[PDB]
Design a binder for these strands. Structure first.
Ligand code: HPA
Ligand code: HPA
Lengths: 338, 338
DNA sequence: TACGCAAACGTTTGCGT
DNA sequence: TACGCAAACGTTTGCGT
C-alpha cells in the first residue's frame, strides 16, 4: 500500500518512507504531496512489515497470574501507563498459575516477538523456572520474587520481609501480645515472606503464636472470611490479627461484623498492600503499603534498559514497604506497661 | 531461520512449513527430522513473518477507559479468557477518556493490524464517534452503549435502564418513600441510563426526589463518600439511597459509619454492579448484578463472528441485569401499608 | 508418492548519481 | 541537491514433477 501511496504522490516509496519517518531531508512540496496521498488514500503504515525489517515490535508482554485482583490490577495499570508513554504496546497474558497455560502464553509471546517480557507468576516451581530459562534470549524481568531466584533475568524486590516485621512491631508497640495471623500462600513471596518478617518480630518479643492462631488464606476475601471465623470461633482468642493482604482483610472484617465482634474494639486488624480502596474499608484499614506504581515503573525501566542499552547482566532493584496508620487498630492491654 | 531449520533437516523450508502447520502430508521420517532440527535449533516460528503472508495477526485490541476499577477489571479478565481459548492475543490499551490518548491507541492498533477491536470508552462525544468511524474497516464492537449509537459497529446492550427501575421498585416495595440517589457520570450509559430507570419507577410511584437528594458521583469510592455525607448531612434526610455503582457504595458505607449512622438500620443502601466482592462489603451489599462475564464473552463472540464469517452488518445483543438481595436494605415505614 | 521452486507479502536502507 | 534502485527481512503457497 505504501506503493499505492508513492504512486498517488508520483515519488518513490523510499521517499514516502523517508517522510513518514523523517529519516532524511525531503523537499517541502514533496513532503506535502506525500502527506496528501497518505491522507486521501487513508494510509496506515504496517508495523508488521516494519517490524519485519527493523527487528523489534515495540511491544511488551506481561505474563501475569490474574488481573481482577486489586493488588494485581493496580500493578498492571501502572505498567501499561509506562508502556504507553514510551511508545510500547502491552500484551496482557493471564496464566492462572497453570504451567500449561504458562508454557502457552510464553510461546505465543516469543512468536509474536515481544521486545521484552514482564513476569508476574506468583509461584515458581523448578518446572517454571525451567521454561523461563528457555527464553533467556528474550529480555525479561520478574516483578515478584523476594530474592533473586535466577541469573538470566532482572528483578525488582519488594522487601516483603521487612514489611512483615513492620506489621508485627506495630501490633507489639500497640500493647498487643495475643496475635493471630492469616497469611497468604506460602509458595509466594508476599505469602511466606510477609509471614516470616512478622514471625521474627514475635520471637524478638518472645511472643508465641499458637498454631490454632495462624490460618492460611489465598488472598481472596472468602479465605479471609473463613480464617477470621475460625480464629474468633475458638475458646481463647487473640486481640489482634495480622492479615497477609487487604482484600482478605476486607473479608476478615465482614465475618467479625457478622459474629457481632467490633473492630477495632473487639479485635484489631492490620492488613497488607494498601490497596486503592482500603481507606474506605469499614473501618478505614490500617495497613502496610506496597509501592505498586514504583513496582511497575521500576520494572518497565530495567527492561527498557536491557532492551535499548542491550544490557546483558542481571540486575535487581529493591523497593520499600511502609506502614499506614488508619482506624482498624486499637491499643492492646500492655500499652501502658512499656 | 526456518531456512536454517530446513538445512539442518536437509529438506525445503516449504517442507518445514508444511510440517509445522500440518498443512499437507509429510513422511514420518521427514516430519521427525524437521522436529529434530526445530528442536536443537531451538526454533520459534515468526508470527510477524507469518502475519505478513496470511493477513491476520490473530490478536485483538481492547481500547478501554481504565483497568484498575473493579467493574472494568472484571470485564477485562473475562475478555482475556475468551481470547486465550480461541487462540487470540490481547492488547490492552487504556485511554482514560482522553481524546488524544484515544486517537493514539487507536492508531497504534491499526498499525499493529489487530484482527478486531473491542471498545470500552465510557463516554462518546461526536469527536470520538468520528475517529471510530475512520476505522470502520477494522471489525469492532463497543461493549458499553445503551442503544446503538452507530451503524458501523456491533453492540452489546446492558439494559441499564431496566436495572435502574429494578432498584427503585425494590426500595419502593420495601416501604421506602424518601429516597436519595448518587448517580454516576451522566455522560455514560451506566450513569444516565441507570438513573433514569430509577427515576421512572419513582414517578410511577408518585415519589419525588428532592434535588438536594441527588448527588453526582464518578464511580470512585471517594465520590460516594462525599455524596453520602452531603445527603445525611442535611436537616431532612432520606431513609434509603440508591447508589449508581458498588465501589461508590462502598464509599457511601464508610461515611455513614463515620457519621455514626447504622446501615441498614439508619439508612438503607442499594448499589449496582454486583462486583466480585460486594458480598464482603460491610454489611453484605444488596445490589443489582450486571453480568460482566457474559458481557465479555458475548462481545468477543460478535467480533469473532465478524472476523471469521466476514459479517458486514451491524448487530446488537442485549444482556440482563438482575437484583441480588443481601443485607444493606431494611423495611421502610410504609411496608405494612400496601 | 512425497516433495521443491520461486514469487510474494509491505516495508527499510545501503549505495548510487 | 534531492531523490530512486533493488535487495532483504521470514514465511506461505500455487504449480510443477
Ligand atoms: O499473589 C497475590 N495475589 C493477590 N493479591 C496479592 N497481594 C500480594 N500478593 C498477592
Ligand atoms: O464507567 C464506569 N466506571 C467504573 N465502574 C463502573 N460501573 C459501571 N459503569 C462504570
Amino acid at each position: 500500500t505504501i506503493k499505492d501511496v508513492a504512486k498517488r504522490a508520483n515519488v518513490s516509496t523510499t521517499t514516502v518512507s523517508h517522510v513518514i519517518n523523517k529519516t532524511r531531508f525531503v523537499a517541502e512540496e514533496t513532503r506535502n504531496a506525500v502527506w496528501a496521498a497518505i491522507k486521501e488514500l487513508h494510509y496506515s503504515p504496517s508495523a508488521v512489515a516494519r517490524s519485519m525489517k527493523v527487528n523489534h515490535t515495540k511491544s511488551i508482554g506481561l505474563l501475569a497470574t490474574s488481573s481482577e485482583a486489586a493488588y494485581f490490577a493496580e500493578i498492571i495499570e501502572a505498567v501499561e501507563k509506562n508502556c504507553f508513554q514510551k511508545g510500547y504496546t502491552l500484551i496482557l497474558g493471564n496464566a492462572w498459575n497453570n504451567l500449561e497455560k504458562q508454557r502457552a502464553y510464553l510461546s505465543m509471546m516469543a512468536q509474536k516477538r515481544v521486545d521484552g517480557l514482564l513476569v508476574m507468576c506468583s509461584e515458581y516451581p523448578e518446572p517454571l523456572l525451567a521454561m523461563l530459562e528457555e527464553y533467556r534470549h528474550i529480555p525479561m524481568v520478574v516483578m515478584d520474587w523476594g530474592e533473586a531466584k535466577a541469573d538470566f533475568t532482572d528483578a525488582v524486590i519488594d522487601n516483603a520481609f521487612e514489611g512483615g516485621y513492620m506489621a508485627g512491631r506495630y501490633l507489639i508497640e500497640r500493647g498487643h501480645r495475643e496475635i493471630g495471623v492469616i497469611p497468604g500462600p506460602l509458595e509466594r513471596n508476599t505469602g511466606a515472606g510477609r509471614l516470616a518478617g512478622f514471625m521474627k518480630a514475635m520471637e524478638e518479643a518472645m511472643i508465641k503464636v499458637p498454631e490454632s492462631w495462624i490460618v492460611q488464606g489465598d488472598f481472596e476475601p472468602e479465605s479471609g472470611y473463613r480464617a477470621m471465623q475460625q480464629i474468633l470461633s475458638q475458646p481463647h482468642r487473640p486481640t489482634a490479627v495480622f492479615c497477609g493482604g487487604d482484600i482478605m482483610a476486607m473479608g476478615a472484617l465482614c465475618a467479625a461484623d457478622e459474629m457481632g465482634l467490633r473492630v477495632p474494639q473487639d479485635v484489631s486488624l492490620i492488613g497488607y498492600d494498601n490497596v486503592r480502596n482500603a481507606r474506605y474499608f469499614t473501618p478505614a484499614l490500617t495497613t502496610i503499603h506496597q509501592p505498586k506504581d514504583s513496582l511497575g515503573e521500576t520494572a518497565f525501566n530495567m527492561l527498557l534498559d536491557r532492551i535499548v542499552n542491550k544490557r546483558e547482566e542481571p540486575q535487581s532493584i529493591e523497593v520499600h514497604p511502609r506502614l499506614i496508620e488508619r482506624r482498624s487498630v486499637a491499643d492492646g492491654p500492655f500499652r501502658d506497661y512499656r
